[PDB]
Structures are given as C-alpha cells and as structure tokens.
Amino acid sequence: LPADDRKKLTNQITENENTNLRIKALLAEMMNDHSVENVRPFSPMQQEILKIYEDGVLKSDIEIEDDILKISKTAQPSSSDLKRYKLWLEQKYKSPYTGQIIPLNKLFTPEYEIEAIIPQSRYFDDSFSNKIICESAVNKLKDNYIGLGFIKQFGGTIIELGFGKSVKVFDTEEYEDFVKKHYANNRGKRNKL
Amino acid sequence: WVDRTKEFIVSESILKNGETKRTFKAVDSEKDWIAIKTKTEQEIEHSH
RNA sequence: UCGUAACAGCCGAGGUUGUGAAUUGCUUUCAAAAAUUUUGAAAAGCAAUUCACAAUAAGGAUUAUUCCGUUGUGAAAACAUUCAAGGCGGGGCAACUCGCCUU
C-alpha cells in the first residue's frame, strides 16, 4: 500500500483485535450461564459468535450500550456491562434463511450452524461477507448451487427442525420484498445470494 | 503581581456585541517570534 | 485503478564550551596588624551580571563569492554527481533566474 492507504489499515486490524477480545470475554461470561454449552477454545463457536453479534448494523440501535461495542475489554464478572450487553443483545437478530429471531443460545446447537452464501464447489471466497449462520436443515437442503430456481422452487416448503417444531421456507411473494428491503443493512452481500 | 510587571501576548477577539475580548497567554520566545519581532521593529521605528 | 512522495535548496536567532574585559562574590593558603581570638593584603580554585570574540560534530580540500564530513554500494580505502550547442521570450537598474522552439 501507499502511505495514505497504510494509515487506515491499522484502524481495521486494531478494531479486529478489539472485537476478538470482546468475543472471548463474552464467551468467558457465557460459560457461567447455561445457555446451551460453552467449551473454551473451540474456534468455530467463536466464529459463530463473531458472525452473530453483527445485529448492531441491523437498523435498530440504542446509545446506552454503545460504548460497550467500541470498547474491547469490558467488565466480565458479576454485575457488569457484559451482562447488560447479553440482556439487550439476546434476540435482536433474525435468521437470514427463516426470518426468525435467535435467542443466541440455540446457535451452538447442531440445529444451527455457519452458512456459506457461495458454495465450496464454486467461488472460493473466504471473506466475512460470504459467511452467515442459520439452521442445519436449510444448510443440508441448500445443495451447493444458490438461489433462483431452487430458492423459488422450494419456496413455502415447511421443514421440521426436530422435536415437533416445523418451520416454513420463505414464501417467495414475501421473500422478494424481504431480500429487497428487510435486511436493510445491505452493505454489499445480501443481493449476491 | 503586587507592584510587578508581567509579559503577555494579547490575542484581541471582538465578540458579537463588539466586546474585544483580551486573551492573555504566557510569552515564550523561539515559537511566537513574529509578534516580538514586529514589536522590536516598531520600537526601532518609533525612535527614528 | 495505481501512483507522490521522496530527495534536495536559500536563510535566521539562540544555547554551550573557551579567550579577553568591567564589577562584585565563596573557599584555601605565608603573615601585614591587634590585644588565644579577629581584621587582612596577595595569589589559587570555583562563579555570578553584561560586552567583544573563537569553535560548534573529529578532520580534509579550495580561492570558486565551491565545498566535503550522520545516505547508499562494497575492499578496489574504490565510488554515486555534471554533460554540446542557437535563437525565441517572461522577470530583475543589476548579479542571475525561469520556460518554448531546432540538431
């Protein structure tokens, strides 16, 4: 890079380690609470949290726990900013492939996992903009090739998530408007699906 | 301050109501040399 | 979408060390003096306020109104730089500087 492009790159990387610090602090707070399970060093669950905490860029926001997002260490034990962050940031994030809020505890459950917008049998992107998380059922049914035909052919299908709970695939009539406006964050990635 | 002289550089600033607010700051040479140089030149000119 | 950002150039005012000087200071040393104590002269060391001046990376060239000396290469104790002419023209009383056209 040139000097001008160099001076900025420090900001993104430093924010990245700040986010990593926050992620592991949040997990160290979570292992004390019986959400589902928390091992310790398991990297994939850390990545899942790193992809699930993006609800801040999803429209609605409040300034109370806004300094907690930009900070890196927080207070972890007992009555702490991490606790209130967990309370507010507990369900304000809907599933991309079912449009249902996630209590953030069912993430580690095998029923929900990381979803690749672009398949492995295709373009080899590894950037965070080509990574989401949703149910295991839709991950199994995605069948590599993405969107169009299949997403319109299977639209409206009802799939059981186990234990008697069945969820419906997006009705394309509503899902067109959803993939047009609902994910209003719309940085660069939703339209590529 | 009693019966003693002080060295300041005054930055005149006229407010909305016409009040020229006089702001005093400690003078330190080698940085704000423009004002002291102009003062010395004015003093030399005055003496003719 | 890269690149430009780096390299250079004309100057200023201090400070420091030191030399000389004016004026005072502190300490030390023979007593010169007084009736065991002080006044002391003169020198030495250390300074203070102010002035003039020398040096300002060790040092080496040169007499051009030129410098080299904190960069890089690498042993060769070796180097890097510059590159003829012809007018056209701008600026500047001047020294000189800056552009265009042609082999």
mmCIF file of C-alpha atoms (C1' of nucleotides) in Angstrom:
data_model
loop_
_atom_site.group_PDB
_atom_site.id
_atom_site.type_symbol
_atom_site.label_atom_id
_atom_site.label_comp_id
_atom_site.label_asym_id
_atom_site.label_seq_id
_atom_site.Cartn_x
_atom_site.Cartn_y
_atom_site.Cartn_z
ATOM 1 C CA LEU A 1 0.000 0.000 0.000
ATOM 2 C CA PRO A 2 0.916 3.687 -0.211
ATOM 3 C CA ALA A 3 1.223 5.770 2.942
ATOM 4 C CA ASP A 4 -2.360 7.045 2.758
ATOM 5 C CA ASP A 5 -3.755 3.538 2.295
ATOM 6 C CA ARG A 6 -1.365 2.329 5.002
ATOM 7 C CA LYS A 7 -2.502 4.689 7.759
ATOM 8 C CA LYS A 8 -6.088 3.427 7.579
ATOM 9 C CA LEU A 9 -5.265 -0.299 7.622
ATOM 10 C CA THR A 10 -4.109 -0.006 11.236
ATOM 11 C CA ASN A 11 -7.632 1.038 12.235
ATOM 12 C CA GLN A 12 -9.408 -2.015 10.809
ATOM 13 C CA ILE A 13 -6.900 -4.503 12.211
ATOM 14 C CA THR A 14 -6.903 -2.881 15.667
ATOM 15 C CA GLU A 15 -10.703 -2.926 15.679
ATOM 16 C CA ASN A 16 -10.397 -6.595 14.713
ATOM 17 C CA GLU A 17 -8.349 -7.483 17.789
ATOM 18 C CA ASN A 18 -10.740 -5.372 19.871
ATOM 19 C CA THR A 19 -13.608 -7.483 18.536
ATOM 20 C CA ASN A 20 -11.678 -10.691 19.248
ATOM 21 C CA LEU A 21 -11.068 -9.542 22.830
ATOM 22 C CA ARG A 22 -14.772 -8.778 23.212
ATOM 23 C CA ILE A 23 -15.731 -12.147 21.705
ATOM 24 C CA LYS A 24 -13.615 -14.197 24.088
ATOM 25 C CA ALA A 25 -14.630 -12.051 27.068
ATOM 26 C CA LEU A 26 -18.278 -12.600 26.139
ATOM 27 C CA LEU A 27 -17.710 -16.351 25.848
ATOM 28 C CA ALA A 28 -15.941 -16.401 29.223
ATOM 29 C CA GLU A 29 -19.038 -14.700 30.608
ATOM 30 C CA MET A 30 -21.332 -17.157 28.811
ATOM 31 C CA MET A 31 -19.711 -20.311 30.182
ATOM 32 C CA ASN A 32 -21.087 -19.287 33.594
ATOM 33 C CA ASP A 33 -24.638 -19.200 32.161
ATOM 34 C CA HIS A 34 -26.487 -22.315 30.990
ATOM 35 C CA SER A 35 -27.443 -21.166 27.518
ATOM 36 C CA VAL A 36 -26.636 -24.466 25.825
ATOM 37 C CA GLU A 37 -22.913 -25.189 26.143
ATOM 38 C CA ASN A 38 -19.514 -23.490 26.017
ATOM 39 C CA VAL A 39 -16.284 -25.486 25.720
ATOM 40 C CA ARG A 40 -13.475 -22.872 25.814
ATOM 41 C CA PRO A 41 -11.083 -22.781 22.867
ATOM 42 C CA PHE A 42 -13.430 -24.197 20.250
ATOM 43 C CA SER A 43 -12.751 -21.768 17.405
ATOM 44 C CA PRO A 44 -15.881 -22.478 15.267
ATOM 45 C CA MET A 45 -18.246 -21.334 18.029
ATOM 46 C CA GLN A 46 -16.137 -18.187 18.420
ATOM 47 C CA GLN A 47 -16.537 -17.590 14.682
ATOM 48 C CA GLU A 48 -20.281 -18.188 15.004
ATOM 49 C CA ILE A 49 -20.471 -15.547 17.745
ATOM 50 C CA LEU A 50 -18.300 -13.222 15.631
ATOM 51 C CA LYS A 51 -20.902 -13.587 12.877
ATOM 52 C CA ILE A 52 -23.943 -13.443 15.182
ATOM 53 C CA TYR A 53 -23.045 -10.225 17.020
ATOM 54 C CA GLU A 54 -23.468 -8.141 13.820
ATOM 55 C CA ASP A 55 -27.023 -7.132 14.836
ATOM 56 C CA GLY A 56 -25.680 -3.661 15.652
ATOM 57 C CA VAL A 57 -25.576 -2.842 11.934
ATOM 58 C CA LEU A 58 -29.133 -4.216 11.641
ATOM 59 C CA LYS A 59 -31.038 -0.933 11.884
ATOM 60 C CA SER A 60 -32.376 -0.568 15.429
ATOM 61 C CA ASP A 61 -29.839 0.666 17.976
ATOM 62 C CA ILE A 62 -29.634 2.494 21.298
ATOM 63 C CA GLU A 63 -26.791 4.591 22.692
ATOM 64 C CA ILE A 64 -26.764 3.165 26.239
ATOM 65 C CA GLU A 65 -24.575 0.133 25.493
ATOM 66 C CA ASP A 66 -22.837 1.840 22.572
ATOM 67 C CA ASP A 67 -19.518 2.412 24.341
ATOM 68 C CA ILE A 68 -19.533 -1.322 25.111
ATOM 69 C CA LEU A 69 -19.385 -2.121 21.389
ATOM 70 C CA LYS A 70 -16.362 0.087 20.690
ATOM 71 C CA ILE A 71 -14.505 -0.961 23.866
ATOM 72 C CA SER A 72 -12.513 -4.211 23.871
ATOM 73 C CA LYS A 73 -12.200 -5.453 27.479
ATOM 74 C CA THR A 74 -15.487 -4.596 29.268
ATOM 75 C CA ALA A 75 -16.236 -5.815 32.764
ATOM 76 C CA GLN A 76 -16.729 -9.559 32.788
ATOM 77 C CA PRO A 77 -17.602 -10.949 36.216
ATOM 78 C CA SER A 78 -20.719 -10.174 38.263
ATOM 79 C CA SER A 79 -22.905 -7.132 37.657
ATOM 80 C CA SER A 80 -21.162 -5.957 34.525
ATOM 81 C CA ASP A 81 -21.591 -4.250 31.160
ATOM 82 C CA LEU A 82 -21.184 -7.714 29.630
ATOM 83 C CA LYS A 83 -24.325 -8.856 31.459
ATOM 84 C CA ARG A 84 -26.478 -5.969 30.225
ATOM 85 C CA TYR A 85 -24.987 -6.406 26.756
ATOM 86 C CA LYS A 86 -26.206 -10.005 26.881
ATOM 87 C CA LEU A 87 -29.677 -8.889 28.019
ATOM 88 C CA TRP A 88 -30.203 -6.342 25.250
ATOM 89 C CA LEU A 89 -28.250 -8.351 22.663
ATOM 90 C CA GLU A 90 -30.130 -11.592 23.223
ATOM 91 C CA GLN A 91 -32.763 -11.725 20.474
ATOM 92 C CA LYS A 92 -32.348 -8.637 18.267
ATOM 93 C CA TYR A 93 -31.113 -10.659 15.270
ATOM 94 C CA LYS A 94 -33.283 -12.616 12.832
ATOM 95 C CA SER A 95 -32.298 -15.689 10.829
ATOM 96 C CA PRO A 96 -31.368 -14.917 7.193
ATOM 97 C CA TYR A 97 -32.975 -18.118 5.867
ATOM 98 C CA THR A 98 -36.108 -18.193 8.036
ATOM 99 C CA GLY A 99 -36.572 -14.612 9.255
ATOM 100 C CA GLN A 100 -36.854 -15.631 12.914
ATOM 101 C CA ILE A 101 -35.058 -14.025 15.852
ATOM 102 C CA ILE A 102 -32.366 -16.148 17.517
ATOM 103 C CA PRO A 103 -32.048 -16.189 21.335
ATOM 104 C CA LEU A 104 -28.287 -16.547 20.712
ATOM 105 C CA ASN A 105 -28.296 -19.699 22.843
ATOM 106 C CA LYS A 106 -29.520 -22.038 20.085
ATOM 107 C CA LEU A 107 -26.509 -21.030 17.967
ATOM 108 C CA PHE A 108 -24.204 -23.717 19.361
ATOM 109 C CA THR A 109 -26.974 -26.307 18.990
ATOM 110 C CA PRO A 110 -26.306 -28.586 15.978
ATOM 111 C CA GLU A 111 -29.637 -27.443 14.542
ATOM 112 C CA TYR A 112 -27.931 -24.124 13.667
ATOM 113 C CA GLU A 113 -24.513 -23.627 12.078
ATOM 114 C CA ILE A 114 -22.463 -21.465 9.714
ATOM 115 C CA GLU A 115 -23.933 -20.933 6.240
ATOM 116 C CA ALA A 116 -21.818 -20.122 3.183
ATOM 117 C CA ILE A 117 -23.588 -17.832 0.718
ATOM 118 C CA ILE A 118 -21.262 -19.063 -2.049
ATOM 119 C CA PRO A 119 -20.628 -22.836 -2.075
ATOM 120 C CA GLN A 120 -17.348 -24.671 -1.655
ATOM 121 C CA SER A 121 -17.914 -26.344 -5.066
ATOM 122 C CA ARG A 122 -17.821 -22.844 -6.552
ATOM 123 C CA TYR A 123 -16.087 -19.485 -5.945
ATOM 124 C CA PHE A 124 -13.529 -19.871 -3.153
ATOM 125 C CA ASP A 125 -14.246 -16.649 -1.239
ATOM 126 C CA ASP A 126 -13.363 -16.711 2.456
ATOM 127 C CA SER A 127 -14.274 -13.125 3.395
ATOM 128 C CA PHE A 128 -16.739 -12.411 6.191
ATOM 129 C CA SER A 129 -19.207 -11.003 3.641
ATOM 130 C CA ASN A 130 -19.647 -14.563 2.310
ATOM 131 C CA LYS A 131 -20.444 -16.084 5.702
ATOM 132 C CA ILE A 132 -23.762 -16.273 7.561
ATOM 133 C CA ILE A 133 -25.366 -18.624 10.088
ATOM 134 C CA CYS A 134 -28.763 -20.334 10.117
ATOM 135 C CA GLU A 135 -30.429 -23.713 10.690
ATOM 136 C CA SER A 136 -28.808 -27.042 9.893
ATOM 137 C CA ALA A 137 -31.864 -28.107 7.873
ATOM 138 C CA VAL A 138 -31.545 -25.276 5.354
ATOM 139 C CA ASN A 139 -27.781 -25.861 5.250
ATOM 140 C CA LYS A 140 -28.390 -29.501 4.311
ATOM 141 C CA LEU A 141 -31.095 -28.603 1.782
ATOM 142 C CA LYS A 142 -29.168 -25.739 0.144
ATOM 143 C CA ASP A 143 -27.400 -28.148 -2.198
ATOM 144 C CA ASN A 144 -24.448 -26.012 -3.277
ATOM 145 C CA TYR A 145 -25.847 -24.051 -6.234
ATOM 146 C CA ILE A 146 -27.515 -20.976 -4.810
ATOM 147 C CA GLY A 147 -30.745 -19.051 -5.300
ATOM 148 C CA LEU A 148 -33.040 -18.692 -8.290
ATOM 149 C CA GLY A 149 -34.559 -21.953 -9.468
ATOM 150 C CA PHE A 150 -34.282 -23.824 -6.193
ATOM 151 C CA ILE A 151 -34.989 -20.837 -3.938
ATOM 152 C CA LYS A 152 -38.146 -20.185 -5.971
ATOM 153 C CA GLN A 153 -38.934 -23.883 -6.469
ATOM 154 C CA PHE A 154 -38.720 -24.773 -2.752
ATOM 155 C CA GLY A 155 -40.339 -21.527 -1.575
ATOM 156 C CA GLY A 156 -43.047 -22.144 1.005
ATOM 157 C CA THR A 157 -41.842 -25.616 1.994
ATOM 158 C CA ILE A 158 -42.311 -26.475 5.674
ATOM 159 C CA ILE A 159 -39.382 -28.306 7.286
ATOM 160 C CA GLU A 160 -39.331 -29.759 10.796
ATOM 161 C CA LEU A 161 -36.428 -28.616 12.974
ATOM 162 C CA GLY A 162 -36.849 -31.722 15.125
ATOM 163 C CA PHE A 163 -38.828 -32.332 18.311
ATOM 164 C CA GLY A 164 -42.115 -31.470 16.600
ATOM 165 C CA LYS A 165 -41.127 -27.940 15.518
ATOM 166 C CA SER A 166 -41.645 -27.266 11.805
ATOM 167 C CA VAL A 167 -40.634 -24.041 10.050
ATOM 168 C CA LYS A 168 -41.655 -22.772 6.618
ATOM 169 C CA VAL A 169 -39.329 -21.704 3.826
ATOM 170 C CA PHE A 170 -39.872 -18.113 2.712
ATOM 171 C CA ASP A 171 -42.958 -17.642 0.638
ATOM 172 C CA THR A 172 -41.382 -16.064 -2.445
ATOM 173 C CA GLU A 173 -44.181 -13.477 -2.595
ATOM 174 C CA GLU A 174 -42.997 -12.060 0.731
ATOM 175 C CA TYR A 175 -39.383 -13.150 0.299
ATOM 176 C CA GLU A 176 -38.832 -10.944 -2.751
ATOM 177 C CA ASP A 177 -39.746 -7.911 -0.643
ATOM 178 C CA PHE A 178 -37.641 -9.361 2.184
ATOM 179 C CA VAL A 179 -34.498 -9.762 0.043
ATOM 180 C CA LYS A 180 -35.287 -6.288 -1.268
ATOM 181 C CA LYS A 181 -35.779 -4.311 1.960
ATOM 182 C CA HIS A 182 -35.954 -6.373 5.172
ATOM 183 C CA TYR A 183 -32.185 -6.870 5.500
ATOM 184 C CA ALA A 184 -31.795 -3.109 5.259
ATOM 185 C CA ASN A 185 -28.140 -3.301 6.346
ATOM 186 C CA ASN A 186 -27.381 -4.060 2.694
ATOM 187 C CA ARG A 187 -23.650 -3.415 2.791
ATOM 188 C CA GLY A 188 -22.604 -5.498 -0.210
ATOM 189 C CA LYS A 189 -23.616 -9.098 0.271
ATOM 190 C CA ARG A 190 -27.360 -9.768 0.541
ATOM 191 C CA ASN A 191 -28.052 -9.230 -3.167
ATOM 192 C CA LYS A 192 -25.394 -11.753 -4.245
ATOM 193 C CA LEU A 193 -27.446 -14.682 -2.916
ATOM 194 C CA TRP B 1 1.510 40.723 40.891
ATOM 195 C CA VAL B 2 1.753 43.489 43.514
ATOM 196 C CA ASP B 3 3.852 46.325 42.044
ATOM 197 C CA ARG B 4 5.388 43.984 39.467
ATOM 198 C CA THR B 5 5.481 43.824 35.674
ATOM 199 C CA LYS B 6 4.220 40.923 33.558
ATOM 200 C CA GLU B 7 4.920 39.815 29.990
ATOM 201 C CA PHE B 8 1.886 38.708 27.961
ATOM 202 C CA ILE B 9 0.867 38.393 24.335
ATOM 203 C CA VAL B 10 -2.715 39.584 23.869
ATOM 204 C CA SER B 11 -4.930 37.993 21.211
ATOM 205 C CA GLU B 12 -7.709 40.509 20.576
ATOM 206 C CA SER B 13 -11.068 38.928 19.728
ATOM 207 C CA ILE B 14 -14.193 41.011 19.122
ATOM 208 C CA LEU B 15 -17.384 39.206 20.134
ATOM 209 C CA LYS B 16 -20.882 39.598 18.679
ATOM 210 C CA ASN B 17 -21.697 42.549 20.961
ATOM 211 C CA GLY B 18 -18.499 44.329 19.888
ATOM 212 C CA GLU B 19 -16.546 43.361 23.014
ATOM 213 C CA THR B 20 -12.888 42.924 22.050
ATOM 214 C CA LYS B 21 -12.095 40.014 24.361
ATOM 215 C CA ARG B 22 -8.485 40.353 25.524
ATOM 216 C CA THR B 23 -6.944 36.898 25.954
ATOM 217 C CA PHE B 24 -3.633 36.739 27.812
ATOM 218 C CA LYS B 25 -1.103 33.951 27.317
ATOM 219 C CA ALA B 26 2.403 33.480 28.660
ATOM 220 C CA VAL B 27 5.059 34.616 26.194
ATOM 221 C CA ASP B 28 7.750 32.109 25.222
ATOM 222 C CA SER B 29 10.337 33.025 22.610
ATOM 223 C CA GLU B 30 11.533 30.802 19.727
ATOM 224 C CA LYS B 31 7.943 29.831 18.803
ATOM 225 C CA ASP B 32 5.821 33.015 18.584
ATOM 226 C CA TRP B 33 8.661 35.171 17.293
ATOM 227 C CA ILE B 34 6.504 37.095 14.795
ATOM 228 C CA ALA B 35 4.903 39.265 17.475
ATOM 229 C CA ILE B 36 8.157 40.026 19.295
ATOM 230 C CA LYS B 37 9.938 40.760 16.011
ATOM 231 C CA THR B 38 7.195 43.180 14.969
ATOM 232 C CA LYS B 39 7.310 44.781 18.422
ATOM 233 C CA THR B 40 11.076 45.288 18.192
ATOM 234 C CA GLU B 41 10.806 46.724 14.682
ATOM 235 C CA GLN B 42 8.050 49.091 15.822
ATOM 236 C CA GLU B 43 10.193 50.203 18.764
ATOM 237 C CA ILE B 44 13.156 50.865 16.470
ATOM 238 C CA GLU B 45 10.963 52.791 14.021
ATOM 239 C CA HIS B 46 9.467 54.888 16.825
ATOM 240 C CA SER B 47 12.884 56.105 17.993
ATOM 241 C CA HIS B 48 13.615 57.352 14.439
ATOM 242 C "C1'" U C 1 -7.233 1.874 -10.758
ATOM 243 C "C1'" C C 2 -2.364 2.757 -9.376
ATOM 244 C "C1'" G C 3 0.870 6.078 -8.274
ATOM 245 C "C1'" U C 4 3.784 11.278 -4.900
ATOM 246 C "C1'" A C 5 6.227 11.071 -2.094
ATOM 247 C "C1'" A C 6 10.822 11.164 -1.500
ATOM 248 C "C1'" C C 7 15.064 13.884 -2.453
ATOM 249 C "C1'" A C 8 17.116 18.488 -2.313
ATOM 250 C "C1'" G C 9 17.995 24.144 -1.780
ATOM 251 C "C1'" C C 10 18.440 29.916 0.007
ATOM 252 C "C1'" C C 11 18.455 31.963 5.049
ATOM 253 C "C1'" G C 12 17.586 33.286 10.735
ATOM 254 C "C1'" A C 13 18.069 33.639 16.036
ATOM 255 C "C1'" G C 14 19.795 31.476 20.297
ATOM 256 C "C1'" G C 15 22.330 27.998 23.619
ATOM 257 C "C1'" U C 16 27.040 25.561 25.114
ATOM 258 C "C1'" U C 17 32.456 25.300 25.819
ATOM 259 C "C1'" G C 18 36.545 28.627 25.763
ATOM 260 C "C1'" U C 19 39.630 33.570 25.463
ATOM 261 C "C1'" G C 20 39.822 38.715 26.972
ATOM 262 C "C1'" A C 21 37.397 42.536 29.965
ATOM 263 C "C1'" A C 22 34.286 45.746 33.962
ATOM 264 C "C1'" U C 23 32.154 44.759 38.862
ATOM 265 C "C1'" U C 24 31.189 42.024 42.792
ATOM 266 C "C1'" G C 25 31.271 37.190 45.496
ATOM 267 C "C1'" C C 26 32.688 31.758 48.270
ATOM 268 C "C1'" U C 27 36.685 28.659 49.862
ATOM 269 C "C1'" U C 28 42.075 27.782 50.697
ATOM 270 C "C1'" U C 29 46.965 29.214 51.681
ATOM 271 C "C1'" C C 30 52.756 32.966 54.470
ATOM 272 C "C1'" A C 31 51.557 36.861 57.594
ATOM 273 C "C1'" A C 32 50.880 42.507 57.409
ATOM 274 C "C1'" A C 33 48.438 44.103 62.061
ATOM 275 C "C1'" A C 34 45.550 43.988 67.069
ATOM 276 C "C1'" A C 35 45.405 42.694 72.261
ATOM 277 C "C1'" U C 36 44.212 32.566 72.482
ATOM 278 C "C1'" U C 37 40.695 35.435 69.167
ATOM 279 C "C1'" U C 38 39.825 38.746 64.566
ATOM 280 C "C1'" U C 39 40.858 42.352 60.995
ATOM 281 C "C1'" G C 40 43.655 41.327 56.179
ATOM 282 C "C1'" A C 41 46.973 42.183 51.525
ATOM 283 C "C1'" A C 42 48.234 38.980 47.542
ATOM 284 C "C1'" A C 43 47.703 34.563 44.830
ATOM 285 C "C1'" A C 44 44.909 29.757 43.506
ATOM 286 C "C1'" G C 45 40.358 27.077 42.677
ATOM 287 C "C1'" C C 46 35.030 27.919 41.700
ATOM 288 C "C1'" A C 47 31.345 31.521 39.684
ATOM 289 C "C1'" A C 48 27.791 35.337 39.042
ATOM 290 C "C1'" U C 49 25.515 40.013 35.583
ATOM 291 C "C1'" U C 50 26.964 42.312 30.923
ATOM 292 C "C1'" C C 51 30.152 43.068 26.340
ATOM 293 C "C1'" A C 52 33.560 41.685 22.370
ATOM 294 C "C1'" C C 53 35.481 37.308 20.078
ATOM 295 C "C1'" A C 54 36.873 31.840 18.737
ATOM 296 C "C1'" A C 55 34.847 26.854 17.965
ATOM 297 C "C1'" U C 56 30.119 24.384 17.195
ATOM 298 C "C1'" A C 57 30.001 17.023 15.094
ATOM 299 C "C1'" A C 58 36.938 14.703 14.781
ATOM 300 C "C1'" G C 59 39.093 16.496 10.263
ATOM 301 C "C1'" G C 60 40.334 17.315 4.849
ATOM 302 C "C1'" A C 61 40.297 20.441 0.305
ATOM 303 C "C1'" U C 62 39.900 25.170 -2.392
ATOM 304 C "C1'" U C 63 40.446 30.599 -3.596
ATOM 305 C "C1'" A C 64 35.201 29.371 -6.592
ATOM 306 C "C1'" U C 65 31.680 34.756 -3.876
ATOM 307 C "C1'" U C 66 32.891 25.926 -4.363
ATOM 308 C "C1'" C C 67 32.747 22.720 -0.613
ATOM 309 C "C1'" C C 68 33.255 17.551 1.614
ATOM 310 C "C1'" G C 69 32.063 15.230 6.885
ATOM 311 C "C1'" U C 70 25.440 11.269 10.448
ATOM 312 C "C1'" U C 71 22.534 8.272 2.787
ATOM 313 C "C1'" G C 72 23.544 4.022 -0.155
ATOM 314 C "C1'" U C 73 27.037 0.231 -2.692
ATOM 315 C "C1'" G C 74 31.183 -2.738 -1.125
ATOM 316 C "C1'" A C 75 37.638 -3.743 -0.048
ATOM 317 C "C1'" A C 76 39.117 -1.809 -5.215
ATOM 318 C "C1'" A C 77 40.219 2.740 1.449
ATOM 319 C "C1'" A C 78 37.258 2.189 -4.630
ATOM 320 C "C1'" C C 79 32.677 5.040 -5.721
ATOM 321 C "C1'" A C 80 27.468 7.696 -6.680
ATOM 322 C "C1'" U C 81 27.283 13.549 -9.159
ATOM 323 C "C1'" U C 82 27.526 17.242 -14.402
ATOM 324 C "C1'" C C 83 27.314 16.630 -19.557
ATOM 325 C "C1'" A C 84 27.292 20.466 -26.874
ATOM 326 C "C1'" A C 85 25.210 23.865 -28.800
ATOM 327 C "C1'" G C 86 21.235 28.685 -31.365
ATOM 328 C "C1'" G C 87 17.716 31.722 -31.029
ATOM 329 C "C1'" C C 88 12.982 32.932 -29.087
ATOM 330 C "C1'" G C 89 10.853 35.027 -24.924
ATOM 331 C "C1'" G C 90 8.917 36.270 -19.225
ATOM 332 C "C1'" G C 91 11.135 38.545 -14.713
ATOM 333 C "C1'" G C 92 15.181 41.558 -12.404
ATOM 334 C "C1'" C C 93 18.558 49.127 -12.518
ATOM 335 C "C1'" A C 94 21.893 44.925 -11.580
ATOM 336 C "C1'" A C 95 24.193 39.826 -10.403
ATOM 337 C "C1'" C C 96 21.174 35.964 -12.354
ATOM 338 C "C1'" U C 97 16.808 33.053 -12.699
ATOM 339 C "C1'" C C 98 12.779 30.572 -15.468
ATOM 340 C "C1'" G C 99 10.225 28.381 -19.902
ATOM 341 C "C1'" C C 100 9.481 27.441 -25.614
ATOM 342 C "C1'" C C 101 11.282 26.102 -30.438
ATOM 343 C "C1'" U C 102 15.592 23.322 -33.531
ATOM 344 C "C1'" U C 103 20.142 19.091 -34.228
#
